[PDB]
Symmetry: D2
Subunit: 246 residues, 4 copies
């Protein structure tokens, strides 16, 4: 029935990087539909402030400090989540990311390593770590936050976009290999979005404006609902038409 | 706020081909979120039966007999819709379509003409006719029902898939040209779905099953919600991973 | 051996629309590698002038007046080609096309019919008609001339781009259905090219210039060579990076 | 003129991994059109054997032992190439790669690091190192050897395909950022090819066979010719229709 198909009541979720921007919007959207959410960031003081605000509003959100670019910390994170949720995870949102803007000539080995670790390896390893919990839930949804620039060339975005292009492909492999476990995997590819993390861009957007965090968060929540049960392996741009505009 | 973003209360919608299959599911999904819907089919007796059932359930659905492959009938349809809705249309769902399965060698000129008229020209002309009403609503959403086979080669689908490939491109042009009028246009590309209209296919689906009409209808409703305000020009496959499966 | 792989010696070819622009370049490129070419246009006086120039240069090119938007004329054309080439055709280049630039609101039913007939139906029917000759050659190559704007939205190009989008899909169906007959089918999708048929466009091209007819013709010849024997079903943009430029 | 457009006479080229498989075919194809080639591999004994055979045939090929997964060795390689070619490099072919086939659950951190280093970082850093020589040549062509599985999900290919997906995106950034330097960048995405490096795959290929190294090498040579001067930023599959087959 419609009511059930459009609900996240009784679900559990992990959202990485939930203290700001898109991740923060995703946490609130998910709890809005009844999910219990676990989140993280590298900043202890900002995380407690977020968690306190959410507890004031009686949202069921918990979290811990975690740098998802660290293998040991990812392992620790998956351990706590599995204990808190009793080994059952409905939802994994790989939102934490990193950004460097330089011409190709300018990129350092350190820049490369940083972007690969936080944008690609983190998501990959966390999917691995989360697979038992996702499988155990009986209805699993992985959503990667990619970027629309993994389909076009934006000045300065070479390694950033390439790591997101890798995520787009990983989406397809996850979708197919774990379909048997009733786990779906999709990617949301935002255009420019107004965030703490963030002229010529908006000129390229048919809508003539940048997006808002909730314009990404809504689709993330939808993709986790029973209503999205036949959607998997997709890369969906949320960019006001940016990438298909001539 | 969340409640408003996920609502179609106070909206008006035209869904072509709403008496069976995907179109029927789309009508019910839209009214479920509070939309007033106008629909059509070529069959007078089946349409009255559908309309009677919906009125019994107190859904606000009206409709008339219309063959959308006929220019005169499309013009008549747009006329009634505009009068019934007082010149304001929030939503246009181009769902009515046609299907012929033959090897390329087998296709007749008549087959070609039939598929182009019902799958491409109908959608194009109705967008033209509906543009003033869509613009007048202040928040317009066009959703074409395409096909996932507009990205791969399925035996017998050559002209069918080609007309849907044309729809996919038209989506991009509509999205960009009418963004100024706060109209969004997107395409949903289903894989095999269980319908009155419809072995080796399901072997190619990671999920190992065909889809259900509501698995398409949910996304159609989502794309019309305020929550989808930064999504335009996209072609989204609803195919259980069919097209990206090796 | 290399010499053979990069040769069209002893091959036969049909190029539609060979009296101007891209088609004219394709005829000369093909004869340059030793092909015998048949071509056509709607203009009797321009065709004889082209044929006379080519005979002066001792190229083996023949041709007749044909409007490829007419079914009867397409049938007549395939009849002459099959007789001249003794029932064996190595190469079919669907280059003849049509162009209308209007906003979506502006397009007439007549505009729509014209573009579908010359850009899509002509190519489709000619592939059907040519299939026995292509199969009989033992090594068949079909190349459609599409457009890079079948992947993005250019103002005024809605129906034009949509017909080329249909061609792109048809390419995939042809490639798969006729692989058994050792026929390959590919599409070349030019950006803006300097032609008799043809500011903001070149600003969008990384190279900062429009293309030349021979920059399309070279790839057409390559795709017909033995060297391209594992290339089929592809849509290759020749656009100086236009479609992937941010 | 045609002769010049289809020639690599007087050009200089670096092909990584030229002692076997696709890379070996690419070296021979390039010298066949008159290029002077520099190549490498990790195996000293196999490289000298290849170089001796080529010198016997009077091909102008030189080379040194280099593990392109090592930064110091890449720097050393670019140093020798620049000295041997007097600071002018027309062609860079990033062919050296690595392959691991495991389910997603099975991949180790070491597997991940290995594939990223050899498939992505190596190509990226070598483009950086080669940029001055490529720019100095006045006509530069970079060709990455990707994989067709960067568009679909093949069992066991998750990290492999993801690194190639990253290469596909990097192609687009290189194409746009360095167009000003008259450098073109494209990717060739092979399906299964018969190589020393290499049942259900061939069932998925319309042609019903795997490809040969020269079926990739031909396109690599073409993309470096003056005839390809308006082709940049493209990812071209050489897969007998594998990725678009239903
Ligand atoms: N904003 C855009 O325009 C845009 C466009 C396309 C894609 N994206 C993608 O969208 C996602 C979210 O972007 P955003 O703009 O919302 O970023 P943001 O505003 O900077 O927020 C990032 C969040 O992630 C956390 N975070 C960052 N690095 C982390 C790490 N290593 N471990 C744990 N947490 C980490 C941050 O907190 P701490 O710093 O305190 O850890 C913060 O909570 C990213 O994947 C980004 O690439 C964004
Ligand atoms: N089902 C699938 O597997 C699948 C897969 C991909 C795409 N699609 C697409 O999804 C859409 C819906 O397909 P479906 O399978 O749901 O079809 P369906 O079960 O046959 O239902 C089609 C509906 O459209 C109406 N209709 C058909 N032709 C019409 C015309 N010329 N004018 C007005 N109404 C017309 C039909 O009623 P009357 O016949 O009484 O007019 C019926 O209400 C189509 O665009 C189709 O191409 C379907
Ligand atoms: N030029 C570009 O910028 C560009 C970009 C993307 C795609 N394209 C495509 O490239 C192809 C060639 O374009 P073009 O610019 O080279 O065109 P062009 O310069 O106008 O040349 C067109 C040729 O086709 C012939 N022709 C046209 N309609 C015909 C018909 N119905 N039957 C037979 N012959 C016909 C023309 O001769 P008659 O008029 O005498 O018949 C002429 O020989 C077309 O498919 C076009 O859509 C072009
Ligand atoms: N074969 C296929 O089916 C297929 C399909 C899609 C894509 N590809 C891609 O095509 C490219 C070539 O593949 P292949 O199958 O031809 O491989 P191959 O037969 O194994 O040949 C690889 C060549 O690269 C050299 N090489 C490997 N690692 C190297 C390193 N770290 N540094 C320097 N040289 C290295 C090898 O020599 P040493 O081992 O002696 O160093 C050998 O010369 C790769 O990028 C591969 O991913 C292949």
């Amino acid at each position: 029935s419609l009511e059930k198909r459009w609900s996240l009541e009784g679900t559990t979720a992990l959202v990485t990087g939930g203290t700001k921007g898109i991740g923060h919007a995703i946490v609130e959207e998910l709890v809005g539909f009844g999910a219990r959410v676990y989140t993280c960031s590298r900043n202890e003081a900002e995380l407690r402030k977020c968690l306190q605000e959410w507890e004031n509003l009686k949202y069921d959100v918990t979290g811990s400090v975690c740098d998802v670019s660290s293998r040991t910390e990812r392992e620790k994170l998956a351990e706590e989540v599995s204990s808190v949720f009793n080994g059952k995870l409905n939802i994994l949102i790989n939102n934490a990311g990193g950004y460097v803007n330089k011409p190709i000539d300018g990129f350092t080995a350190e820049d490369f390593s940083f972007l690969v670790a936080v944008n690609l390896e983190s998501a990959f390893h966390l999917c691995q770590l989360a697979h038992p919990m996702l499988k155990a839930s009986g209805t699993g949804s992985i959503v990667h936050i990619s970027s629309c620039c993994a389909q076009i060339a934006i000045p300065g975005h070479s390694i950033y976009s390439s790591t997101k292009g890798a995520i787009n492909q990983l989406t397809r492999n996850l979708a197919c290999e774990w379909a048997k476990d009733n786990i779906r995997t999709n990617s949301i590819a935002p255009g420019a979005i107004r965030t703490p993390g963030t002229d010529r861009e908006v000129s390229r957007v048919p809508f003539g404006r940048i997006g808002e965090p909730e314009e990404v968060a809504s689709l993330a929540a939808f993709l986790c609902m029973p209503s999205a049960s036949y959607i998997t392996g997709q890369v969906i741009c949320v960019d006001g038409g940016r990438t298909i505009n001539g």
